[PDB]
Amino acid sequence: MLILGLNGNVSAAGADVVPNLNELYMHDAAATLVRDGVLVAAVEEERLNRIKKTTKFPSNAIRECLAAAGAKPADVDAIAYYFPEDFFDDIFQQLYTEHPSVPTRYSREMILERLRVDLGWAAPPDILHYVPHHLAHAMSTYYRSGMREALVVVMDGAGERNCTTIYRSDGAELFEIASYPVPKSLGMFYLYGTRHLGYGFGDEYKVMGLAPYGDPSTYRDVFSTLYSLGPNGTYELIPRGGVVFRMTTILREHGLQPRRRGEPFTQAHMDFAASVQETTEQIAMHVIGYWARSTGLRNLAFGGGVAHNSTLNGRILTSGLFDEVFVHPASHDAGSSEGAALVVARERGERVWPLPRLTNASLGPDLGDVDSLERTLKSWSPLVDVERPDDIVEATAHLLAAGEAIGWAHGRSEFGPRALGNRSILADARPKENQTRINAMVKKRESFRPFAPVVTAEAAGDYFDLPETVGHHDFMSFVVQVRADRRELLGAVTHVDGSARVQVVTEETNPRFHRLVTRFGELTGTPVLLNTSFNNHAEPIVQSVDDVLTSYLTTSLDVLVIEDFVVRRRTELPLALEDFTIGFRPVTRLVRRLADVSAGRPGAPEVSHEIYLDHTSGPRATISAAMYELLTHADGVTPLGSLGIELTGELLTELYDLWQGRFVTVAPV
């Protein structure tokens, strides 16, 4: 049976269902394809529409999943949606009361319309089926664990009814044993803390990264008025919601004002981070500990968005409550779509359980074959030199050992937030100064951010203190201690408390990446690399050849390795664009705006030129009259060189700024 699982809102490519549709309303849109129980293809819409954690309907994800799996629309037996229909339709109705001119169409109709318009794919209404949100999460987590018995815990932001649901397995089935209502959400608590630290939706892992620098005791007393642990795994949490969240009143009362975007981080900020992280662990371990003791289960499969807290995951491993713990690479909403697919297949009669443990998150589209790639690379030759060594792994280990920081792109893209050796930025794990270098210089972000190591399965025990409890480390789900005698050596990837978010790579999972790490260690003595996501500040992980080339050229990475090829910039900045086109993204908007900005009596209006990305939280940039004129010609087909506009260094430098911001698409003819 072939099932398509979906999550996300219903918005088209170009405009949203409502103006500035809340970013909480079905974020991390994705599609999964499940064939006889096996996840055969999976990718998040963000990788394709280039909008971080997008809520847009995942049309592109569907197209690519089908092609990646060698399936056609007609092969799909059913479509599974990650939330119940009456809940989703309740949300739409709410929206419609707030926006009187938006037509009252419900989710079923709207989903099918998207399939029809974007994919030319019409189906009978009853192809669509809907599933409880927590069950979707839980089925995904449990089935992908391969475990024959497990305590299965889902902790997130919010389902239709609960923030947290506890299940025990019963062979192929799940028995729900407990839940905690939406107001007790750890996900929502962590997000509030993240917003207080001057961040937004999606930035939770940054707070988790800052927390080790802080002292949880500075604000312990204040935090103790925000929650309590009760008997038998019960807890209370300060009730979110209202004109003013009660938490806001309390913080302001104690003299804590929220950090602004781009301000430095004080010790006070780090302390607050530590308090948010500590509080989250206290409650999560209170719940998990109680239910582990009560059920006597020693296998845990943990999911929902809170399972992306790898520090918490580490605490789970060291508690000694379990013998084995599994966390899915996509424990956020994108992963629950495949859980919906599993539920729907089961309801339809399919019996696939049990399945092998998921070991490989590389389920997105690949880069095409190497022949077509070589051809594409020739089209980029005004900007880059291309070489094809006898052995790409051999060449790459040498690049790494000589001290180069590289883009590394091959095979199918990683499903879930973590790069794992298919769309990675790589460098030596040893030099401590690589933290500043990859951050401040290459990615352009905050310096405090820690980096994650990858080690081979063969060498893991030589660098890390792996706990007695067996975690599955294929997806960087867990924090572990670096061996004390290796902390100095592993300068770029050891946090201030001696910890690291570790990727333990096996040959089976990723032979090329495993061989790379193996060879690097033969050359240097140390089979460990730094592995961070391949993206600048303005984009999600790169997906296509176009994305990879753009990202390489608009950051200051030393060199790009894509499939069999080594690619290096020919100049410092990619300014020779004569034979390149400029195009708009669906969300690009270019304006000449007039406004009378004087005080007193009205006077002559002033002209501004501006480009912006018309999605929730979309960036914006002032541009010159000359840039405006140029971009009126951004048709995605005409070469820049033959627009009869003089391509000055000034104009091209301005264009480069916009390319770096991803406001436009720059590609060869």
Q: Residue 530 in contact with residue 463, Cβ under 8 Å?
A: no
Quick one: 161 or 483, whose CB is closer to its own copies?
161
Q: Residue 4 in contact with residue 310, Cβ under 8 Å?
A: no
Quick one: 245 or 353, whose CB is closer to its own copies?
245
Query: Which does residue 333 touch among its own copies, Fe ion, none (CB within 5 to 8 A, set by kind)?
Result: Fe ion
Query: Which does residue 351 touch among its own copies, Fe ion, none (CB within 5 to 8 A, set by kind)?
Result: none
Stretch that binds its own copies, among 344-352, 383-391, 534-542, 602-610 (CB under 8 A): 602-610
The number of beta carbons lying within 10 Å of the beta carbon of residue 29 is 29
Quick one: 113 or 458, whose CB is closer to its own copies?
113
Give bridge partners of residue 251 from the DSSP assignment.
Answer: none
Quick one: 86 or 385, whose CB is closer to its own copies?
86
Helices (H), 15-84: 45-49, 59-68
The Cα–Cα gap between 388 and 563 comes to 10
From candidates 230, 255, 257, 485, binder to its own copies by CB under 8 A? 257
The number of beta carbons lying within 10 Å of the beta carbon of residue 98 is 9
Give bridge partners of residue 317 from the DSSP assignment.
Answer: none
Quick one: 188 or 427, whose CB is closer to its own copies?
188
Stretch that binds Fe ion, among 155-163, 254-262, 316-324, 570-578 (CB under 5 A): 155-163
CB of 340 to its own copies, least distance (A): 19
Quick one: 271 or 333, whose CB is closer to Fe ion?
333
94 scored as a contact of its own copies (CB under 8 A): yes
The 3 state secondary structure assigned to 383-398 is CEEEECCCCHHHHHHH
CB of 268 to its own copies, least distance (A): 14
232 scored as a contact of its own copies (CB under 8 A): no
Sign of CA dihedral 425, 187, 272, 281: negative
CB of 133 to Fe ion, least distance (A): 6
Query: Which does residue 604 touch among Fe ion, its own copies, none (CB within 5 to 8 A, set by kind)?
Result: its own copies
484 scored as a contact of its own copies (CB under 8 A): no
**Half-sphere exposure of residue 157, counting CA atoms within 13 Å on the CB side?**
16
Residue with tokens 């992280």, as numbered in its chain: 277
CA angle in degrees (0–180, nearest 5) for 226-230-236: 35
From candidates 44, 45, 156, 547, binder to Fe ion by CB under 5 A? 156
The Cα–Cα gap between 127 and 79 comes to 6
Query: Which does residue 631 touch among Fe ion, its own copies, none (CB within 5 to 8 A, set by kind)?
Result: its own copies
Query: Which does residue 93 touch among Fe ion, its own copies, none (CB within 5 to 8 A, set by kind)?
Result: its own copies
From candidates 368, 511, 583, 619, binder to its own copies by CB under 8 A? 583
**Whose CA is closest to 111, among 128, 91, 124?**
128
339 token code pair = 């859980």
Q: Euclidean distance between the first and final Cα of the chain, in Å?
A: 42
Q: Residue 119 in contact with residue 63, Cβ under 8 Å?
A: yes
**Half-sphere exposure of residue 570, counting CA atoms within 13 Å on the CB side?**
12
644 scored as a contact of its own copies (CB under 8 A): no
Quick one: 32 or 185, whose CB is closer to its own copies?
185
Sign of CA dihedral 421, 427, 428, 434: negative
CB of 158 to its own copies, least distance (A): 7
The number of beta carbons lying within 10 Å of the beta carbon of residue 176 is 16
The Cα–Cα gap between 445 and 538 comes to 11
**Whose CA is closest to 140, among 5, 295, 325?**
5
Quick one: 28 or 414, whose CB is closer to its own copies?
28
Q: Residue 630 in contact with residue 651, Cβ under 8 Å?
A: yes
Quick one: 184 or 196, whose CB is closer to its own copies?
196
239 scored as a contact of its own copies (CB under 8 A): no
CB of 229 to its own copies, least distance (A): 25
237 scored as a contact of its own copies (CB under 8 A): no
541 scored as a contact of its own copies (CB under 8 A): no
Quick one: 184 or 328, whose CB is closer to its own copies?
184
Per-residue binding letters, 315-354, with Fe ion (x by CB under 5 A) = ------------------x---------------------
Give bridge partners of residue 32 from the DSSP assignment.
Answer: 5, 42
From candidates 121, 192, 408, 415, binder to its own copies by CB under 8 A? 192
The number of beta carbons lying within 10 Å of the beta carbon of residue 491 is 16
What is the binding site for Fe ion (CB under 5 A)?
156, 333
What is the binding site for its own copies (CB under 8 A)?
13-14, 20, 87, 89-91, 93-94, 96-98, 100-104, 118, 158, 182, 192, 195-196, 198-200, 241-245, 248-249, 251-252, 257-262, 583-586, 588-597, 599, 601-605, 607, 631-632, 634-637, 665
